[PDB]
């Protein structure tokens, strides 16, 4: 099924993630048709909360980073305490314990589907250059190979 | 359909790999039970022969370098005419222009399925290690999306 398919590229995708990065956690973050967003996937190393299927509403997608991420933003962050980020943000990522994120986006058919993120727990990194591209890459074959397989 | 749905893979991971290496030719050789190889899909720049649905019977694959294919091998070759090849190795790729060539498994299952191969038609090309890396990705996650989807 469609949804199988997806869920099988998500999968994929948490997996060769956090091997390529070698970083604690790797997500898919799916979002419905407003944007609240399911913990779908998850790649996790030993130790660490699993936040698969958790839902979060996080309402900045919907009212200020859908377009944004539409057309490729990437975020990638060092240190979470250090990015004025406000307490409700911060209350989202405590429990999961991530020091450091980067987010790419899986874009399918020029719509947001959903992000694809790894954590860095309880540390925080630098995420260098020749990271941020495979990490995109990876989101980017993703997506198409879901572009083609419907 | 388990048949549609590896074409759908095969095609991104040829354009995704031309694009990536800028590359005359990117190829997906997938093996049968006789490990006779089949060019089961093509990205190619103009002015060069598609080699796509050509079946290539070259026995060195099953007689010494499956398993290591399984585990990671690859072969990048600089310049096809200083490797001091057999014409029989030259004879079956002169009807498709190789003169450097880079050669990554695709594992499935624990099995060989085939070969990602990229090939520079008109001059050497020493393949770089950030290009390998690439493109040795490049076919690891198609190969895993497959594991997977099915
Ligand atoms: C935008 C925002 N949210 C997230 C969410 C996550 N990061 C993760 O790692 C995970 C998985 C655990 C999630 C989920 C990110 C990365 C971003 C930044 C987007 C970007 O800059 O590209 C955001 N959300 C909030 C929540 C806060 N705002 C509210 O109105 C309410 C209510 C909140 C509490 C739930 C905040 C503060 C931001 C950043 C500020 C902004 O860009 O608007
Ligand atoms: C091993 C060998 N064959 C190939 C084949 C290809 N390169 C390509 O680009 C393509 C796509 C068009 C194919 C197919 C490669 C890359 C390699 C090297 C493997 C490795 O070392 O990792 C090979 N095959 C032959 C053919 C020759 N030997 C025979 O017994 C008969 C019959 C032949 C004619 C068909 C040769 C000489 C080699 C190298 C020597 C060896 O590894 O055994
Ligand atoms: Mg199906
Ligand atoms: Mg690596
Ligand atoms: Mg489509
Ligand atoms: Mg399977």
């Known amino acids: 099924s469609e949804l199988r398919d997806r869920q099988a590229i ?21 979002f419905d048709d407003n944007y609240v967003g399911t913990v779908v996937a998850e790649s996790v190393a030993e130790g660490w909360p699993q ?13 200020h980073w859908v377009e944004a991420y539409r057309q490729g933003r990437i975020q ?20 999961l314990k991530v020091r450091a994120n980067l987010v790419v986006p ?18 925080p990194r630098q995420w260098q250059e020749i990271e941020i591209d495979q990490f995109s890459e990876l989101a980017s074959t993703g997506s198409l190979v879901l572009e083609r397989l419907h």
């Open 51 to 63: 936040a698969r299927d958790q839902v979060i509403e996080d309402p900045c997608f919907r009212e």
């Open 10 to 30: 998500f999968e994929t995708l948490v997996a060769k993630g956090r091997e390529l990065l070698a970083c604690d956690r790797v997500i898919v973050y799916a």
């Open 76 to 95: 990638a962050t060092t240190d979470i305490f250090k990015a004025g980020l406000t307490e409700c943000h911060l209350n989202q990522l405590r429990p």
């Open 106 to 123: 899986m874009v399918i058919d020029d719509q947001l589907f959903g992000l694809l993120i790894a954590h860095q727990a309880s540390e």
